[PDB]
Amino acid sequence: QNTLIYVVPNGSFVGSNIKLTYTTTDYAVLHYFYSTGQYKVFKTVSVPNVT
Amino acid sequence: STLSLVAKGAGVVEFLLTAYPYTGNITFAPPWFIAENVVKQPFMTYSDLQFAKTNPSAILSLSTVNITVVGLGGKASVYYNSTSGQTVITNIYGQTVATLSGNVLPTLTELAAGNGTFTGSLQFTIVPNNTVVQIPSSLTKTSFAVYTNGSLAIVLNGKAYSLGPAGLFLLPFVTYTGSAIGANATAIITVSDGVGTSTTQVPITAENFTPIRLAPFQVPAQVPLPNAPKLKYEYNGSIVITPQQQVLKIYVTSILPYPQEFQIQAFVYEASQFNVHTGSPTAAPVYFSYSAVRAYPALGIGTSVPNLLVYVQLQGISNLPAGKYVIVLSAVPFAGGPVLSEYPAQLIFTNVTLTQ
Amino acid sequence: FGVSAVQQYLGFIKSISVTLSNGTTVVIPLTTSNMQTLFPQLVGQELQACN
């Protein structure tokens, strides 16, 4: 119900990442914060460069 | 309300940039090296004060208001002075040489929200300038008036802007009497003969930038030396010159093509007259000699080994009495002096033991 | 979550070089037959879980 799964081939494993973009489910929030740039929020999860 | 301003990252300034020659062939990169004391993190201003006042933990644009390139003797700057809203460019001498309307510097855009990495574009080029260096005929039999490297120029929006002499900024350089000569040089050869005086000109291109390494025979020559200063390498290994030897076998390593001829000059100082601790001569050389090295391939022509075995000859080794000495080998170029000498520029044997 | 895993071509032994230095970093000319037959093992199992 709450799980997201990203699968990449062998060649795309290095730095395989997911970017989450959350948008308001509200018209007023889209309208009133278009200028400030805080009506949609994005973040990323990536495979760490590990030793 | 003024609140926490937290900077979890800034711009990154590195070395070994992709070289762009002044010639039309820009896709060739001679090894460039921004000189000492340029350590990342430029100063730049946020594009929005109000958001940064609370927390700049999101996607932002950073207007660069400080770019510093430090050379050996000075440093040039390109900074967007927001007080006047003008891009001010100063050369290595520390004097304002350019003022440009608006922000011609690109605005470093963050790659991610609350990350700290800001990316833009920085181009560079070389604009030749004038600086006369005189090589006397007392050591080469032919005088050389050399116009030096030129001037390093930052290229913004496709337009170049000089930042002072590139000889101090860029590596390699060739030091003659403390004067640095690099690519885009111009050597006027003054030949003196029985007829009189003649003058010819050989221009050094931006593709004749050519690092050249001088190495001892017992030290690897196919492996670049990272432990060699820009001006010299002091080999502390013990060397004893037999009386049957009048030539010293050394290696000359070339990373870029080297078509023009030169010579290796050997300056012999007494061990007491040379300060091995600092590597600087405390007195005039007690002897001088030269060996003309005509740049020719050893193996296959053109595709020979990047290492040349040079027999540095001496115009009389019996002139120096047996004892302890320091011998400095320096590359002095002939007939259109090309660019050479990084890591090392000179080869200083500090423990020469001449025995006869 | 309901999907089995398959082969991932996720690397290869870079080389087997030997130093022999009178000035010579001896980069070995890599031969395919020798290299495959020096590491022919089909199953190199790991030891610890989640590592």
From Swiss-Prot, chain C:
Coiled-coil spans in chain: none
Modifications made to the protein after synthesis: Glycosylated. C-terminal glycosylation sites are modified with a heterogeneous family of glycans, with the largest having a composition Glc(1)Man(2)GlcNAc(2) plus 6-sulfoquinovose (QuiS).
Glycan-modified residues: 22, 51
Superkingdom of source: Archaea
Assembly, per entry: The mushroom-shaped unit cells of the Sulfolobales' S-layers may consist of three SlaB subunits and six SlaA subunits.
Function, in words: S-layer large protein. May form the highly ordered outer sheath.
Protein family: Belongs to the Sulfolobales SlaA family.
Name the record gives this protein: S-layer protein A
